[PDB]
Structure formats: C-alpha cells, structure tokens
C-alpha cells in the first residue's frame, strides 16, 4: 500500500504529532537518529534516501517559532527534513483572523510549495492527515487556509483530520467559541471527515481507567497517537479484511456535511492493572458502547448511532468479531437509526500494538478502535452554539477581529450555517 502525508498545524497539532511519529519510529524500529537499523510498510509514511536515513513524509507549520524550535532542537532533530519545519515570526495570538487573513497567508504559500514538492515524489498517494485544534489561531485559521488551498491543488483526494474539540466545561481560552465555530464553517465544504477528541473526556478516562492521578499534555497526546496508528494500520501492515484510507469516508459519511465521527479506543489499561483482566473480544468490543469510554464527552445514549467502524488490531478472531458485533445490534439501550440497518464496518490487521518506552498503557495483545458517528455529537455543537450566541449578542470580542481584515458579517454567516447543521442533524435523527 502507498503513501500518506501528515500535516501538523498549530501548537496542538505540532505537539500531538511529535508523539505520533514516536510510535511510527518504534513500530518499524526506526532510530530517532533517522537511520534504520541494519520493510515494505514504512514507504507509506517515510521517504527513502541514498543513505539509510529515512525522511518522514510530513510537514510542520506553526506561526510561533517556540513550538517547532523544541522539535528542531530536541533529540528528534535529525529525523525531520530541515525545510519541512516551517516557522513564522509572530504568533497568531488565538485570533482566527490573524491565522487566516493577515499572517496566515504570508506563509501559507511556502507550505504549499513543500507539500507540492513532496506530493510529487510519491508514486502513489492516498490523502492527508491534518492535526490541529479548535481553540487556537494557527490550529484553526491556518487549517482553514490549507483545507482551501489543498482542496484546489489536490482535490478529490482524501482529506482527514484529528481535531481537539472544545471540551464542554473545561476551557483553556476565552475565545474558543468564536474561533471554534469559524473554522467549522470553512472546513465543512473542504473536508471529508473529522476525528473529534476532547481533553476533558480523555482526562476523565486517564484518571478513571489508566489510573494515574496527574496527567499532562505529554501524556494525553500519546493516546491520540494510538488512534492514529490504529487508523493507519491498514495502509502499512498485512492482515485479513484491510481497510484503505479512502474507505473511512464512504462508511462513516452518510451525508456530506455529517462527517464528525468521534473517536473511541479500547482497552486503556495500565501495566500493573492488566494482570487481572482477560481481554476477550466482547469485553473490548463492549467497552466502546458506553458513556464512560469516549474521547469526546458526549453521552451517546442521548443520540443514535448511524455508522460505526471497528478497526481491530493484532491477533484477532474474525468469527468472534462477527459474533461480538451481532450482540451489540440487539440491545435496546443501543439504538441505530431506522434508515441504516447496515451499521458496522470491520477491519483487522495482524500487528498487535507497540508500547512507547515508559508508556503508561499496558502491552495488550489485541486492540480495537471505534469511529462511531452519532447524533449525540449535535449536543456538543448545540452547546457551543449557545456560547457563541451569548457573546456575540453583546458584541463583546468582535473588535479584535475587525482589525485583522475580517468583516462583521462573517460571524453572523457562520452561526446561521451552524444552525442549519443543527437542523440537519435533527432531520437525520428522525425517520421520514
């Protein structure tokens, strides 16, 4: 199978990626020095060279020099091609306008050049994985730019992303609703499907299952690394019933706008706690169908599932996966919409996970990642829309935007667009 390009935008995406690429190095046994120790898989995510040093096929962009500087000076400095690390001069300062209109465009073209110079050097190409956040300038405004530009230059190719959605109650910035909605509007028409994640839900899981009292960003971003490696496992490792990258959108996207499947991973168990667990197929399969196991803090029983992919990993029994899924289809609490009787998409790859040195999670012999699309996520959008209405009703932060080349009417258009999305979910939530 063939190549994929990973774009890491903003502090969150850039910081998340460094953890993700640590896994790829471990799985294929690539040295942090870049030189593979003395096979057909790494070609998808790594570029060959005359020497033994493989070059990762990804680009990092961040208007603030600080974040990339840590990578550019960290022990992984030699792994990345120096010209792939694009850095501006000043930060976007959490303002959507700066990262999209004034300073985002001053460096966007340079990023396109390297991607173009990178996409041209792959005999095959699947799509893009874009890592970013919803609550920052570079990770929200610059993302919207690249979705537009990459859509034009490389349209009709898959465009996937993993976005840190604003958590329900915990908040890390004041202008998250303003910046969160804006990027959503511009990215709906130029994206395939977004893999939402919340730090609140992940924190809730980490203190609950993993059983470590004091998590950090350096900890959580690694779990987000596992979902990516499991998602991209088909493109690298052989196994029965593979699932190529272009397959995700077809199964998980009944409608063009409705492309927000929240991520769910299992089993998250610590090394010590695992010795008293059996890890049967229904056990791990059942873990994905409860409020207590989500990367987004949306109560699934509030809504109805409409598409679910169970990308199994490691030594797995297809017979049990077929049987385990069948039971979940016949439980009253679980409720698939009326119009999608065919609501599962199984995928198996014969490569059990690999543990990061010193990693908190255990060495599970078998793993599964669920990518269910549920109408309960409309609550997250509904709550977010409530926040935006409260602030913009008083016009309490617009001035920071109008001064950066963003017209007043954009805010009104976005919410009205989001309001239609709210109704779109409601219509799909019923049966004609």
């Amino acid at each position: 199978m063939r190549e994929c390009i990973s774009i890491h935008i903003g502090q969150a995406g850039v910081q998340m990626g460094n953890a993700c690429w640590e896994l790829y190095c471990l799985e294929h046994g690539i040295q942090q020095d870049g030189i593979i120790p003395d096979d057909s898989s790494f070609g998808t995510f790594f570029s060959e060279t005359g020497s033994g040093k493989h070059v990762p096929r990804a680009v990092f962009v961040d208007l603030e020099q600080t974040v990339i500087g840590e990578i550019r000076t960290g022990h992984y400095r030699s792994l990345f091609h120096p010209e792939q690390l694009i850095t501006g001069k000043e930060d976007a300062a959490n303002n959507y306008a700066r990262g999209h209109y004034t300073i985002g465009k001053e460096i966007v073209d340079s990023v396109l050049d390297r991607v173009r110079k990178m996409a041209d050097q792959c005999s095959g190409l699947q799509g893009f994985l874009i890592f970013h956040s919803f609550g920052g300038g570079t990770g929200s405004g610059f993302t919207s730019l690249l979705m537009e530009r990459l859509s034009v230059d490389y349209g009709k190719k898959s465009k996937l992303e993993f976005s840190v959605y604003p958590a329900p109650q915990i908040s890390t910035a004041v202008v998250e609703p303003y910046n969160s909605i804006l990027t959503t509007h511009t990215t709906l028409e130029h994206s395939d499907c977004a893999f939402m994640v919340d730090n609140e839900a992940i924190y809730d899981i980490c203190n609950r299952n993993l059983d470590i009292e004091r998590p950090t960003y350096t900890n959580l971003n690694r779990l987000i690394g596992q979902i990516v490696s499991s998602i991209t496992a088909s493109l690298r490792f052989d196994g029965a019933l593979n699932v190529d990258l272009t397959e995700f959108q077809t199964n998980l996207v009944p409608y063009p706008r409705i492309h927000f499947p929240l991520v769910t991973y299992s089993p998250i168990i610590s090394a010590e706690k695992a010795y008293h667990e059996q890890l049967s197929v229904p056990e791990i399969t059942n873990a994905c169908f409860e409020y207590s196991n989500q990367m987004v803090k949306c109560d699934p029983r509030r809504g109805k599932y409409m598409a679910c992919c169970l990308l199994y990993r490691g030594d797995v029994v297809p017979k049990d996966v077929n049987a385990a899924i069948a039971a979940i289809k016949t439980r009253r609490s679980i409720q698939f919409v009326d119009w999608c009787p065919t609501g599962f998409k199984v995928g198996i790859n014969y490569q059990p996970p690999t543990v990061v040195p010193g990693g908190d999670l255990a060495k599970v012999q078998r793993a599964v990642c669920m990518l269910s699309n549920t109408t309960a996520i409309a609550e997250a959008w509904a709550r977010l829309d409530h926040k935006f209405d409260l602030m913009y009703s008083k016009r309490a932060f617009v001035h920071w935007y109008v001064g950066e080349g963003m017209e007043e009417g954009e805010f009104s258009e976005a919410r009205e667009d989001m309001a239609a999305l709210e109704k779109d979910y409601e219509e799909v939530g019923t049966e004609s």
């Binding site: 000076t73 300062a93 959490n94 908040s171 998590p215 950090t216 932060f397």
Partner: protein, 430 residues
C-alpha cells in the same frame, strides 16, 4: 523573534525597572558585567528576547531610561547592577518636573522626548521582529505620568500594530504621597485609554497589605515591593523566553483579557507567597496555589474583587505541573464563585503553562484579572477630582506651563464615561 524593548520613566519606573532587570538577568543567569553565566541552554535560545549582543558575550539589555533630572538615573549607574546598561540609552534632563503633569508633558518633556525617540528607533531597527513595547511608570508623579504619556503616544504613532502594555502604580485609596495625585492621575488615564492595549494597575497600599499579612517582614522598603512587581511582570513574558506545554504571548493575553477596547485595565496577582521559616508548614501543590489567586488577600490592586464581577481572567503557570489540575481547578473555581463572574461570557479563565519556573522555586502563577470592581478606584479618583476642581485648587501650576483648564474638564468627562461603561456590565443577561 518577538523582541521586547523596555521603557522606564519616572523615579518609580526606574527603581522598578532596575529591580526588574536584576531578576531577568538572574533567570537567564547573566552576570552583572553583562557576561552570560547560566547553566541551561534554554537561557541563550531566547536571550535575544531582551538582550542585544555585542562581540565578546557582553549582552546589552535594550532598556530606555528617561527621567527629567539626573537624580534617580545617577543612582542606577552607580548601583552594583548599573554597569550592564548601555551608556547611550540613559537620557537625562537638567530640571525635573515638580510633580505637575504639564511641565513633564509639554514644556520640559517635549524638549527631551525627541532625544528618547532617537534611541528607541535604534532599538526597534535592531530587532528582526519587535513584538511590542513595555512601559513602567507611575501616575502620581510628573515625569512618569507626563513624559510616559507623552512618549507612549509617540511610539503609538510610529508602531500602531505592535503591543504596548504598561505597569503603573495607582493612587492608594486612603493614603496619598503627593497632594495633587488626582490631577496627575486623571490626566494620565485620559491619555492612556486611547493609546495603550493593557494596563496592570498596582498600588502601594495593596502591596503593603501583602508584605505583613501573607509574608511576615515588617519594614518592607520600596526595594522589596518592586521585587513583587518585578516578579509579576517577568511572568507575563515567560512564554516568550522559555518553552512550555501551553505557551502564552503578549498578544494572546490582550485578545483574551480585553472584551471591549477601552476596558483593558487589569489588576495582577502572584503566588506562592509565604513568609520565610513558616514556609515549610505549607504544601506547594496546585490546589492551594489556585485558591491563593482568587482571594482579595492576594490582590495587588486596592479594589476588592468581591464587590465587583470578573469579566476575563488569565492564569500563567510555570514549572512542571499537572495540566489536568491546571484546568480542573479553574472549572471548580468558576462554579464555586459563579456569582463573581458575569453571565454574558460563557467562560472567563485563560490558562497557560510554562516549563521553567522562577529561579529559586518549582511553581509559580502570575494571576491577571479584569473585574468591574476597578471602577471603584476610578470613581474614587472622580470623587477627589471634582472636589479639588470645584475650587481650582491647584490649576495655576498647570495653566502656567501651556495648558488650558478645558483639558481638565475633558479628562474628567472621559473618566466618568469609563466608570459608566464598567457599570453597564454589572447587570446580568436579559
């Protein structure tokens, strides 16, 4: 990358400035002679954020020192830490303002401001990407109030886009160290609301309340109060100088902490604060730290936050810490004191975490607040101003240096509006 050029005016500004540079030199591990002697590579990666470089490792900080008379500057140059500064950056007159705003802004400051601009531009052109300007002054005085407002306007005209924040000492509620503070204070605010992006109001009485209450150190000289102020301001710029999990920026704080353009007056806060000796009977975990940021007892502004309501709040943490608690506690804080925050803003807390704590500590949080209770301060100044201006108490010292009393009325009217604007947001939604 994001260079800061520091401006200090007035006796209070220079003295706070002088202490302010000692700590940053200490944090980066810079010798008083200008030779770097730190132990962490992260101190040199960003040493250009404050310090220029001359061949030989002599790092020359880009601070601009201006006072209308050589009094305070001569002490700085004679001080142990005074050799670090560039000789040219010092700008000195020969007749200091007599605490009156007019002389230091119109007749005497004008003759000297042009000289200062000639050096500030040289600092601006020497930086690849000059982030913004930082000013340390006092409203009560004449040199700090007058020439600072004269100079803040001039740098505003040349570089409108850049950030321009200020740390100012504000008249105390019941004590006054100058008779004509309300006149200088009111005049200086009028010229600041229109030109500065943020202002960290502080007052000595509130800072005095810290010295003996939470700390136990009677006889705290100004040399110690400035250290508290020094530490707080160095916290605001930390992310520009060291890595972190969630980096902040001078513009990041401005966007979050300023809902409306005029309402940019904040009031700072710092922790941990504990007296020596008794320090060992207290824990340094995040929970007790956070509670210390949301109580009036640890506010450096005389106005008590309880009387008013919080609009926006930014907590800039430092050191190795659990990001969960750094955000779990904020959520609990907001629900505990929901009445203390306005309803029309769905969330008000801004969190930033840095990797390098302050020198000699393993945890630090510079609190910043934008509460409506500050209107009481400006209302108090309005009460004092109308009393004095109702009889032209001291107008003759001002009109005698090229000024018209019409300006006093303009400043009073503008001040009243600022108070009114804060009041309008006391009410809840609908």
């Amino acid at each position: 990358m994001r260079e800061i050029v520091h401006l200090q005016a007035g006796q209070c500004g220079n003295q706070i400035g002088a202490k302010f540079w000692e700590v940053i030199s200490d944090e980066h591990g810079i010798d008083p002679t200008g030779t770097y002697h730190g132990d962490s590579d992260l101190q040199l990666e960003r040493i250009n954020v404050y310090y220029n470089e001359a061949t030989g490792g002599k790092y020359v900080p880009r601070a601009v020192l201006v006072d209308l008379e050589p009094g305070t500057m001569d002490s700085v140059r004679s001080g142990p830490f005074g050799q670090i500064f560039r000789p040219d950056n010092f700008v000195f007159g020969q007749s200091g303002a007599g605490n009156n705003w007019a002389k230091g802004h119109y007749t005497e400051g004008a003759e000297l401001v042009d000289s200062v601009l000639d050096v500030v531009r040289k600092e601006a052109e020497s930086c690849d990407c000059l982030q913004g300007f930082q000013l340390t002054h006092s409203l009560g005085g004449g040199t700090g109030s007058g020439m600072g407002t004269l100079l803040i306007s001039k740098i505003r005209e040349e570089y409108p886009d850049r950030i321009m924040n200020t740390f100012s000492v504000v008249p105390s509620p019941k004590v006054s160290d100058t008779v004509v503070e309300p006149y200088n204070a009111t005049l200086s605010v009028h010229q600041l609301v229109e030109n500065t992006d943020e202002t960290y109001c502080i007052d000595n009485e509130a800072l005095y309340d810290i010295c003996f209450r939470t700390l136990k150190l009677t006889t705290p000289t100004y040399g110690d109060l400035n250290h508290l102020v020094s530490a707080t301001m160095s916290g605001v710029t930390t992310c520009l100088r060291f890595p972190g999990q969630l980096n902040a920026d001078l513009r990041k704080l401005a966007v979050n902490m300023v809902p409306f353009p005029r309402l940019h007056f904040f009031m700072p806060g710092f922790a941990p604060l504990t007296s020596r000796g008794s320090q060992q009977y207290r824990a340094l975990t995040v929970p007790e730290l956070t509670q210390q940021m949301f109580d009036a007892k640890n506010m450096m502004a005389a106005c008590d936050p309880r009387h008013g309501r919080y609009l926006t709040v930014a907590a800039v943490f430092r050191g190795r810490m659990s990001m969960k608690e750094v955000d779990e506690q904020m959520l609990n804080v907001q629900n505990k004191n929901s009445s203390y925050f306005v309803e029309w803003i769905p969330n008000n807390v801004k969190t930033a975490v840095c990797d390098i704590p302050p020198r000699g500590l393993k945890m630090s949080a510079t609190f910043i607040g934008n509460s409506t209770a500050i209107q009481e301060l400006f209302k108090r100044i309005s009460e004092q101003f109308t009393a004095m201006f109702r009889r032209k108490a001291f107008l003759h010292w001002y009109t005698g240096e090229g000024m018209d009393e019409m300006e006093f009325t303009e400043a009073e009217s503008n001040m009243n509006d600022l108070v009114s604007e804060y009041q309008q947001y006391q009410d809840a939604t609908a």
